[model samples]
Target: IQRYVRKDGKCNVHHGNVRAETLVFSTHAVISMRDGKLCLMFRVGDLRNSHIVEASIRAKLIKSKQTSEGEFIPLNQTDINVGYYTGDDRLFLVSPLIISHEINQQSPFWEISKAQLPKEELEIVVILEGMVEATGMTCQARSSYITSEILWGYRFTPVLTLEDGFYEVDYNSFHETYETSTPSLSAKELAELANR
Candidate 1:
């Protein structure tokens, strides 16, 4: 029921594209725990299950360090798992899909934080790619988040609601986040503690 509310609000965010530029207005994130381990999350939304033939919020980290290959290389997008998928690589894309990245050694954010932040000055760029049903228009929306934009100790709000046996989403809260005391230790530190 995301479009239902987004329609009523009647704003620029309601449309999939803005003057030929595919727009993903609902882009936000959180630092939360999954399976008892800290995680980094990125979410993109408002795509209908039927209207979208395929969709995914993908990203990569661009480190400040020089590669041995003598070139600037995008660290590459991580393996993000969402709440739902359509059996294939495509997301079910119901309302707002919480595309979360688990922060572990394999993660690009493995050693990132404030006190001793990853000195990479890493730029995290996330893109949303979805195929529209009306014209099979494959549109991709891109955005970037520098180190300062990466806020710690916060979690996203539960924008979904269940009423009268029907599901609903609060697009108003789609980009919302709340403060919480998530451990400041980076994945590397966490791993060190476990190796005792």
Candidate 2:
């Protein structure tokens, strides 16, 4: 299990001499929610299950004003600088809530009416209700404010099929299987056990 550490001389992030480095490629996140714990899986899944715990994406809007330890820390604002770990085999499945838009402000309304206005914002909302999840290598990840990168994890994309239900496959590993648990792979195993 990983804990939050200060970025001072005794940086808990670089436990021992092993310093965590940034990934090469831009990685994606598996947004899922579990027991109030929003699970964010990496795009790659080849790394160890424990390492799959990617950086926590803080809800700036939600936990902005919350804080601790006499710090005027905003809720979910302070970068605990902590790694991720799952106690159980269950993985939480959270839908990626993407609110994409081209412009941060409203478009010119005098030129056009509300109904005739062009897409002021381009929001591609991907509902995780039924999406394919696949595993990929996590190149690099960046938090909202933190300058130094912490731990790295393998990313994954759940496999989606038209004929069969939702499943995940590993290109690195040939032994492919049907997975339909939470975002985490362990959750799939737990679900299988429950079904039987």
Candidate 3:
């Protein structure tokens, strides 16, 4: 039930430290300095605002002039009628609300997507710090099946900060570094704003 996943990542000459969950802001880079190489990763999860995340990523790719090849398509917004299922099967989730701040809204596709990770200008360092899973036998007859899964839902919602608030990053090159590796600067050098 426990594992010590080694911290694997590289470091930049400037940034203090970076991780997978680090948000990418304007003119900011997600640095990946680990295991002798630097890289960035993007994932499309069953987020409440899946549409926004999809759209943002597409706009970024198109603006960056990245060649569109295989599986790399512009992100489209999900319909309001889309259904969400829980592992327990009894809890089916669907959000029809368009104005409620309580519900999760889609984040910018480009901001969420890890495909066009800003490497030349910025680097991102990420580490897989292990995970908790529920694994066991369902029944004696189904011994061959392993019901191992990550527990994600209302159970993990309270600790989940980004779900309701969305992803926002403050990039400041002028002022000193705050708690986050990236610093928060003034409006002159680097202004901060929120999208989605």
Candidate 4:
């Protein structure tokens, strides 16, 4: 399935012909270990040729609540476990950027184990709003990731590199991923093991 889902967000300047969509959203959820803890990361392709883009990234995950009638229903705009890793809310686009969400005991999926590969039907909505250097205007992009799209035991391949005071941007493998080792047990189970 295609990861880049474009949206027509509000804008002050609407020169439709000059409209160049640079705000790319990567909804492919990546799960990997960082410093001995699990993390969920997403890639944002910032390959604008004529613009210097800076964006504030935000993530909203879906949740549910029970009613007095003993019925559970889905809810939006609920809290998520990990906030922007290290204040990554605003990223000055120099290359393809990564949106990292640290996973720990506070994570909603702390009870999720590899054995439960079944779909959770949960969705993660990402918002990217920022200024484009060329246009001198603010823009935003949106996308989401469902359970089927989250790649477990996988990590993103780097797309940015430096040579002699110059850098290049590549998207050949920006959405591509390769498998890595991850624990089979859930965070809750892992914590139990530590106590024993």
Supply the global lDDT for candidate 3: 0.19
Please give the clash total of every predicted structure, in order. Answer: 0, 28, 20, 0
Predicted candidate 3 versus true structure: per-residue lDDT over 1-196, tens digit per residue: 2211223522111222222122222221122222322222222111122111111121111122234564433432222111222222111111111111011233122232222322222212111111211222121100010111111110111111122223221222311111212222211122123321
RMSD of 1: 6.7
The order by descending TM-score is: 4, 1, 2, 3
- Expressed as tens digits, the lDDT of each residue in 84-181 for candidate 4 is 65665767664577777776677777777766644465788887777776778787778988888888888988876544333445567788788999
The per-residue C-alpha lDDT of model 2 at residue 161 equals: 20
Residues 61-135, candidate 2: write the lDDT tens digits.
Answer: 113332355655334321211122232222222212121111111211112222332323211111111112233
Q: Sort by lDDT, best first: what order?
A: 4, 1, 2, 3
In terms of lDDT, model 1 sits at: 0.62
lDDT of 2: 0.26
TM-score of each: 0.72, 0.20, 0.16, 0.77
* Error of model 3, residue 149, in angstroms: 32
Candidate 4, residue 193: how far the Cα is off, in Å: 1.7
lDDT of 2 at 33: 35
Q: For residues 107-163, could you state the per-residue lDDT of candidate 1 as single tens digits?
A: 767776546653446666777777876666787777877666666777777787765
- TM-score for model 4? 0.77
- When 1 and 2 are scored with TM-score, the better candidate is 1
Model 1 residue 66 CA deviation (Å) reads: 1.6
- Using TM-score as the measure, which candidate wins? 4
